[PDB]
Amino acid sequence: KSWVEETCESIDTPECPAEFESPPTLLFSLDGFRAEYLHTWGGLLPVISKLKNCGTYTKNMRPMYPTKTFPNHYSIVTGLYPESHGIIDNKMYDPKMNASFSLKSKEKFNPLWYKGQPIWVTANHQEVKSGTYFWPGSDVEIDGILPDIYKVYNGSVPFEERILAVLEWLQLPSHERPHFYTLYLEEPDSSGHSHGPVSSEVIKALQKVDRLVGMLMDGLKDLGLDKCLNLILISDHGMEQGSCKKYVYLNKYLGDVNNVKVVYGPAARLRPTDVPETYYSFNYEALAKNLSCREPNQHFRPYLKPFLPKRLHFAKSDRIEPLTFYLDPQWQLALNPSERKYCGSGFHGSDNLFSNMQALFIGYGPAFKHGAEVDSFENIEVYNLMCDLLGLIPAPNNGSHGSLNHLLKKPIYNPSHPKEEGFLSQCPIKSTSNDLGCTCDPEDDDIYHMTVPYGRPRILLKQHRVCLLQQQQFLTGYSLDLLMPLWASYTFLSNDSNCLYQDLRIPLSPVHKCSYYKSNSKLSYGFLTPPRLNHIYSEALLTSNIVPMYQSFQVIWHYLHDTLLQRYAHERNGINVVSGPVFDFDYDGRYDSLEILKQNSRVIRSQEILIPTHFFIVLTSCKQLSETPLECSALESSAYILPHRPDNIESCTHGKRESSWVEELLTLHRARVTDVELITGLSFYQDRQESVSELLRLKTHLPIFS
Ligand SMILES: *[C@@H]1O[C@H](CO)[C@@H](O[C@@H]2O[C@H](CO)[C@@H](O[C@@H]3O[C@H](CO[C@H]4O[C@H](CO)[C@@H](O)[C@H](O[C@H]5O[C@H](CO)[C@@H](O)[C@H](O)[C@@H]5O)[C@@H]4O)[C@@H](O)[C@H](O[C@H]4O[C@H](CO)[C@@H](O)[C@H](O)[C@@H]4O)[C@@H]3O)[C@H](O)[C@H]2NC(C)=O)[C@H](O)[C@H]1NC(C)=O
Ligand SMILES: Nc1nc2c(ncn2[C@@H]2O[C@H](COP(=O)(O)O)[C@@H](O)[C@H]2O)c(=O)[nH]1
Ligand SMILES: *[C@@H]1O[C@H](CO)[C@@H](O)[C@H](O)[C@H]1NC(C)=O
Ligand SMILES: *[C@@H]1O[C@H](CO)[C@@H](O)[C@H](O)[C@H]1NC(C)=O
Ligand SMILES: [Ca+2]
Numbered sequence: 001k002s003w004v005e006e007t008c009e010s011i012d013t014p015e016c017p018a019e020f021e022s023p024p025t026l027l028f029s030l031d032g033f034r035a036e037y038l039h040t041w042g043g044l045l046p047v048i049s050k051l052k053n054c055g056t057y058t059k060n061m062r063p064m065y066p067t068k069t070f071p072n073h074y075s076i077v078t079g080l081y082p083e084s085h086g087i088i089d090n091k092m093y094d095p096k097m098n099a100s101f102s103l104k105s106k107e108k109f110n111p112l113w114y115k116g117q118p119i120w121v122t123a124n125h126q127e128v129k130s131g132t133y134f135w136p137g138s139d140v141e142i143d144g145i146l147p148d149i150y151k152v153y154n155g156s157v158p159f160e161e162r163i164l165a166v167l168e169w170l171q172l173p174s175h176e177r178p179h180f181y182t183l184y185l186e187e188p189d190s191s192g193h194s195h196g197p198v199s200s201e202v203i204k205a206l207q208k209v210d211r212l213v214g215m216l217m218d219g220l221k222d223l224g225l226d227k228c229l230n231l232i233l234i235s236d237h238g239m240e241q242g243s244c245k246k247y248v249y250l251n252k253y254l255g256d257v258n259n260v261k262v263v264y265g266p267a268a269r270l271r272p273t274d275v276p277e278t279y280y281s282f283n284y285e286a287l288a289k290n291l292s293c294r295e296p297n298q299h300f301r302p303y304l305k306p307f308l309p310k311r312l313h314f315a316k317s318d319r320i321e322p323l324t325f326y327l328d329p330q331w332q333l334a335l336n337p338s339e340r341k342y343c344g345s346g347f348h349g350s351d352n353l354f355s356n357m358q359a360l361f362i363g364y365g366p367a368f369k370h371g372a373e374v375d376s377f378e379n380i381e382v383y384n385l386m387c388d389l390l391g392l393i394p395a396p397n398n399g400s401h402g403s404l405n406h407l408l409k410k411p412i413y414n415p416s417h418p419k420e421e422g423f424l425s426q427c428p429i430k431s432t433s434n435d436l437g438c439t440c441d442p443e444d445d446d447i448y449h450m451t452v453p454y455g456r457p458r459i460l461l462k463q464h465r466v467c468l469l470q471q472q473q474f475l476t477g478y479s480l481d482l483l484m485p486l487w488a489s490y491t492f493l494s495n496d497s498n499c500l501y502q503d504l505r506i507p508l509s510p511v512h513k514c515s516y517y518k519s520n521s522k523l524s525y526g527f528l529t530p531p532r533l534n535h536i537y538s539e540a541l542l543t544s545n546i547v548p549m550y551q552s553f554q555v556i557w558h559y560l561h562d563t564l565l566q567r568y569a570h571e572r573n574g575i576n577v578v579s580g581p582v583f584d585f586d587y588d589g590r591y592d593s594l595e596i597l598k599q600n601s602r603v604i605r606s607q608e609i610l611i612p613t614h615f616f617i618v619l620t621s622c623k624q625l626s627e628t629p630l631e632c633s634a635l636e637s638s639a640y641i642l643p644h645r646p647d648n649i650e651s652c653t654h655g656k657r658e659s660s661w662v663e664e665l666l667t668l669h670r671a672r673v674t675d676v677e678l679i680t681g682l683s684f685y686q687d688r689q690e691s692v693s694e695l696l697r698l699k700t701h702l703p704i705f706s
């Protein structure tokens with residue numbers, strides 16, 4: 001009886017043949033295996049379905065941005081964001097090197113492209129042999145290291161021969177046998193491109209790929225290793241149906257110009273022709289402004305590289321062009337109709353939160369639970385997972401180590417909460433009392449737990465000076481070094497102008513006075529905690545609850561609290577809110593040091609002001625609608641990092657439909673709670689009852705669009 005014909009068998013303890021001390025780990029990749037394939041065509045894929053039912057499976061695996069083969073395949077084995085491991089796209093360019101990159105190029109085998117540290121390099125440093133077959137980065141030697149058994153990419157090699165090749169390696173002597181293995185197939189990406197996600201060729205391809213995995217499992221069984229191997233069946237990205245009618249050509253707004261180069265696709269980037277002479281000299285800002293809101297319902301959007309949604313993490317690399325393009329689903333962009341390969345073929349590269357860009361993940365073996373279905377997770381988390389399976393100390397990566405502990409029978413690493421590095425001090429009443437020049441028209445522990453019911457946010461900043469200011473409706477963490485609130489937490493239940501009051505607990509700043517703010521300048525002040533809380537709550541008008549805010553952003557911020565927040569409190573039976581300013585001028589995704597902070601403090605209206613690049617907001621509710629935010633059994637988080645812009649060009653306010661464009665901006669800039677943590681240097685939910693591993697799972701979550 002073949003492996004697919006046998007029923008499920010619990011592999012609680014690894015049953016290994018002699019010469020084996022611990023089960024090896026194979027990473028099997030199927031390029032272009034969209035997550036929707038297995039959801040719908042499970043009955044046509046008997047082998048893969050058994051792996052799903054007897055292993056650890058996830059409905060959707062979120063890939064990196066852009067959704068291309070090389071960046072993702074390399075992000076899997078490095079656990080790094082594409083902006084950090086160097087491989088931004090299949091075709092890209094580095095200005096500092098004056099060299100282009102391609103899969104079919106001599107530049108591909110250049111070690112100067114590949115940053116970070118892949119798993120086979122990690123295994124090599126810790127005396128673990130590794131045998132790869134066609135994995136991106138396996139052909140090239142990184143840090144002077146090559147896998148003990150490798151094969152230079154040759155797409156002509158038949159699939160059946162690839163499986164047998166790995167099977168031959170598994171039989172090597174105990175001293176010369178690799179412990180980590182890789183496998184790569186071009187299907188169903190190839191069939192996906194040429195005929196579309198919904199075709200007879202993909203069904204024929206899926207069945208071909210399904211039987212091929214079945215060949216491997218029967219082969220493992222004949223070697224007596226079917227219950228002694230850890231298999232991770234993964235993919236790089238999904239597949240979306242492109243259309244000729246749904247394609248964007250830049251020439252229509254610019255003309256048949258030759259001063260600019262466009263890397264076509266759903267994640268288009270633009271660089272000047274005179275390169276690297278004008279790579280930086282070229283002002284991209286003008287081109288972006290000249291390209292925004294040209295169509296009534298534009299299916300693309302010009303983005304300066306730091307102005308992209310932070311959830312994408314697609315800015316801090318030399319190879320990423322300073323001008324990028326975000327497109328609606330099923331749409332691609334190019335300069336001229338001649339550059340593109342074809343328009344009505346299956347494509348990929350769209351937003352990694354899109355439904356059809358989602359990838360596959362099935363963990364099977366003695367180390368994985370049987371028939372366990374877990375929530376969605378990013379592919380950068382897999383790197384740490386493999387380190388635990390190979391007993392390796394992971395290189396510094398972007399994955400939350402331990403967040404995938406729920407997948408394993410016996411978890412190897414037990415994570416802990418980050419220690420508080422902030423110098424926490426106290427602010428009593430010391431400075432009374434300046435005149436603010438404002439016109440106004442006519443025990444403690446019990447009130448604490450109501451505002452921070454999951455525990456106060458911990459200050460991960462080193463070594464920032466932070467004060468805790470307690471109020472009757474909210475608790476706010478105030479910064480003494482920046483003289484503005486870092487965060488403000490309050491609980492908003494289901495149903496419950498030019499004036500300000502000086503907070504005598506904080507030192508007076510010239511920007512606290514209403515006299516500082518004129519009605520002509522676009523810069524004004526906003527509240528972290530809404531004043532319309534619970535007559536009117538007056539402590540929200542405290543000086544320590546205001547932050548410098550553009551007037552254009554006030555359009556989004558007020559509607560966020562006056563309309564959406566109240567609606568969300570009814571739908572989710574109340575919400576706990578933590579809000580604050582974001583300062584990331586070097587657009588690296590992490591909080592800025594005091595040094596770079598002093599460099600970006602502009603001066604406006606005769607006063608020095610550090611103005612926020614973004615504003616974060618984390619909404620927490622109960623998973624059980626019967627419970628209020630003060631009595632949650634399980635949490636329900638959703639974070640947002642809203643861009644602080646002087647204008648709403650991104651939104652195309654033109655047409656004046658305010659209730660529409662705002663929510664679309666909110667949904668677009670949703671982010672992981674971890675993302676907020678990384679960018680503010682704060683740690684949430686530390687006093688929450690769930691374990692650390694559970695909390696990591698919660699904080700790294702993002703919803704899939706459509
Ligand atoms: C995802 O996960 C990855 C993995 O960690 C994260 O990527 C890391 O980001 C951090 C910060 O963003 C990186 O640290 C910085 O490294 C840079 C660059 O290093 C080189 O820079 C110069 C080259 O011109 C050179 O000066 C450096 O030379 C030496 O520097 C010091 C001197 O003492 C020495 O200790 C080093 O060994 C070097 O020999 C070097 O060649 C560097 O510029 C940064 O320095 C800043 O901070 C240091 C203190 O650390 C400070 O002294 C400086 O003033 C300066 O402010 C900093 O070291 C890290 O290298 C990245 N890791 C990799 C491999 O990419 C990424 O952040 C994560 N993403 C997200 C969004 O979380
Ligand atoms: N030259 C080269 N091509 C590769 C390699 N790996 C995959 N490819 C090819 O690149 C394609 C992936 O591109 P994509 O899926 O991003 O559109 C696949 O069709 C595959 O044949 C490699 O390591 N080297
Ligand atoms: C950059 O590359 C192009 C072609 O590779 C070459 O013609 C040009 O001279 C190079 N410029 C520099 C600065 O080396
Ligand atoms: C690629 O692999 C095929 C199948 O093994 C082989 O016949 C062919 O010679 C290889 N091509 C190259 C470029 O060596
Ligand atoms: Ca930063």
Ligand SMILES: [Zn+2]
Pocket residue numbers: 031032068069070189236237
């Ligand atoms: Zn691919």
Ligand SMILES: [Zn+2]
Pocket residue numbers: 032069189190193348
């Ligand atoms: Zn492809």
